[PDB]
Structure 1
């Protein structure tokens, strides 16, 4: 009816969340999950999910616990499987007497089914402890489940007066090496990286994660041999990128969003997703919906002003990450985003400053769509 181990429960669930976060570079498309199993006031098993196709966090914790799971309390950051050999029946089979879940399964057709199954077989169950943190841990995955739309981070880098290139086109190092290394850490956590054909034609980028540019913090949780390249997505409405561009010659897969199928021979890692047309342009809303159906949780956008403005105007951006260099390029220089049709101040895209921070000599601004 009520107990007095709330502080202990909070300590173990916080540990389970710490463990879950250790999967964030590699679990895609699965969510990050952690599990801690406590017997007589000491932790006898822990685990987290690391890669799709590997065991769930509860299974790792039960393997550690062994016989010690009999009579133990399990803390899990997400409701255990109900039919996936499922984690619910593994927890019961091990003799767990109590289960605490941070949050219920986000799919409404199966939400609570696991907890009920444990309750049925005599387990004391509850859910909600540190729900808010469990939500934050899988922000992008959860938004995709509940809306069908992947989480879209739009990255911008510009001068103090909002400029991304001189009028001459010269863009060589507005922002700092530190900013580039910071982008690499955020890239490594994204399910996919997305760009436009115009960016690929103008820049010939690789759009990969370089493990050597990662901070010693993230390099400690990310062994080099487990490096996961985010899926590289290229919007190419008119099939102008060639099979000789750097992007499709890196490790990992590359997906081209196309109007119609390309006729050339491409490397094995390159796939085509056919998106329908809206007026003369490839339909951005439909592209995102199809990517959501393909279980793409989060997308890091590296493109120019044209795609940045198009995504903004389609209402598809969830957050802006803006790197500002302490430089003025002047009013003839190129701007941040093209917003065709915008004429009145009150129609302008509006945001909220969440976090601002120094990044080398630059500053980084995190905004959402308020």
Structure 2
């Protein structure tokens, strides 16, 4: 019945997923007497909301029209979306889900019911929830959504005994990582990897599939915040990661006394044993409005995040190669000497990416 318009609405909402952070993905569909007369989605932060975009396009035809929104309309003064709907005289509003704030939820929808509008909530809620896993987790929990990525060979190895980790996964796999990088609020790495590989960890618009490039105009490329974990300030100001377009954040235990570019700032995290308290680092990040973190780490940091229980999702790319028994493993799990204490997961989705396969796992 209504499912076509909402589905269209969430498809519209996904158009903003590369540039919407720290705001979520929202799409608006306005139908009057069975004909769409308004469409919009949120694109950047501080820019016009989705419902406003669609009301501005619908104009006079919004009177007595139904509005499909992927979330509860903004209910607080930019002037709030919930009142703009009233100003335009929409007679019916369908929202896929409510606000994630524990108290603010339902406020907007009530205000329309108080002003005589038809309101309902929950239609395609699960699809709406999946569009904003990071934001919703940060709005409910203090913590962001964490994506641990791993790219290995069939036998679980990430680099040969020579250290040649240079491109064991497929070029299609690298394009797939670029897409998932591009919609990530932030990218996280350890100093162990920075010293070993001296990486860029920047979203390279060139190596993006053209389907995405048709939705991501290059001039609006948002470079995700780069977070480097350096509890002992081993990274130097001459490493590639810091002299890159976009901003770099260093999780340090004490301030480094050298001079750094303006696009580099330092976050001080308290210490646990000999290093940062990783959970606390995730906490402060949540307090700074970071929705989702894409983790590009070697075996050490991957083992840490798992052993701390900070991983919400495992993304594993497997290449159809056998890389030998003496090649570097996937993650370092100290004290794991019996397999009953091994970490346990659940396969959500398995998909083909060129000659590779990509495995999506959840903790439980």
TM-score normalised by the chain length of structure 1: 0.96
Asked whether the 8 Å contact 2:102–2:140 carries over to 1, the reply is no
Question: Which residue number in structure 2 is paired with residue 307 of structure 1?
Answer: 301
Whole-Å separation in 2 of the counterparts to 1:43 and 1:344: 60
226, 230, 237: which one aligns with 2:220: 226
Q: Give the SS at the match of 1:246.
A: coil
1:227-286 CA-to-partner distances (Å, cap 9, x unmatched) read 111111000101111111111111111111110112121111111111100111111010
Q: CA deviation at 1:172?
A: 2.5
Whole-Å separation in 1 of the counterparts to 2:358 and 2:183: 17
Task: Please tell me whether residue 287 in structure 1 is matched to residue 284 in structure 2.
Answer: no
Q: CA deviation at 1:126?
A: 1.1
Question: Which residue number in structure 2 is paired with residue 190 of structure 1?
Answer: 184
Q: CA deviation at 1:358?
A: 2.1
Question: Which residue number in structure 2 is paired with residue 4 of structure 1?
Answer: none
Q: CA deviation at 1:148?
A: 1.2
Whole-Å separation in 2 of the counterparts to 1:358 and 1:93: 48
Whole-Å separation in 1 of the counterparts to 2:104 and 2:150: 39
Question: Which residue number in structure 2 is paired with residue 165 of structure 1?
Answer: 159
Q: Give the SS at the match of 2:222.
A: coil
Whole-Å separation in 1 of the counterparts to 2:357 and 2:29: 38
Whole-Å separation in 2 of the counterparts to 1:128 and 1:162: 41
Stretches of structure 2 that go unaligned for 5 or more consecutive residues are none
Range moving further from structure 2, 353-362 or 97-106? 353-362
Q: CA deviation at 1:360?
A: 2.1
Whole-Å separation in 2 of the counterparts to 1:237 and 1:39: 58
Asked whether the 8 Å contact 2:97–2:128 carries over to 1, the reply is yes
Q: CA deviation at 1:23?
A: 0.5
Whole-Å separation in 1 of the counterparts to 2:161 and 2:354: 26
Range moving further from structure 2, 50-59 or 360-369? 360-369
Q: CA deviation at 1:19?
A: 0.5
Whole-Å separation in 2 of the counterparts to 1:99 and 1:174: 50
Q: Give the SS at the match of 1:306.
A: helix
Q: What is the number of equivalent residue pairs in this alignment?
A: 363
1:81-124 CA-to-partner distances (Å, cap 9, x unmatched) read 11131111110001111111111101011010101111111111
Question: Which residue number in structure 1 is paired with residue 92 of structure 2?
Answer: 98
1:326-358 CA-to-partner distances (Å, cap 9, x unmatched) read 222222221110000112212111111222222
Q: CA deviation at 1:169?
A: 2.0
Asked whether the 8 Å contact 2:135–2:291 carries over to 1, the reply is yes
Q: CA deviation at 1:125?
A: 1.0
Q: CA deviation at 1:303?
A: 1.1
Q: CA deviation at 1:290?
A: 0.7
Q: CA deviation at 1:292?
A: 0.8
Say what the alpha-carbon RMSD is for the aligned residues. 1.1
1:158-195 CA-to-partner distances (Å, cap 9, x unmatched) read 12111112223232222122211111111111110000
Q: CA deviation at 1:67?
A: 0.9
1:119-170 CA-to-partner distances (Å, cap 9, x unmatched) read 1111111111111111111112111211111111111111211111222323
Question: Which residue number in structure 1 is paired with residue 343 of structure 2?
Answer: 349
Q: Give the SS at the match of 2:111.
A: helix
Q: CA deviation at 1:362?
A: 1.8
Question: Which residue number in structure 2 is paired with residue 20 of structure 1?
Answer: 13
Q: Give the SS at the match of 2:347.
A: strand
Whole-Å separation in 2 of the counterparts to 1:124 and 1:159: 55
Range moving further from structure 2, 189-198 or 144-153? 144-153
Q: Give the SS at the match of 2:98.
A: coil
Stretches of structure 1 that go unaligned for 5 or more consecutive residues are 1-7
Whole-Å separation in 1 of the counterparts to 2:322 and 2:30: 56
Task: Please tell me whether residue 211 in structure 1 is matched to residue 205 in structure 2.
Answer: yes
Whole-Å separation in 2 of the counterparts to 1:251 and 1:28: 18
Q: CA deviation at 1:361?
A: 2.2
Q: Give the SS at the match of 1:265.
A: coil
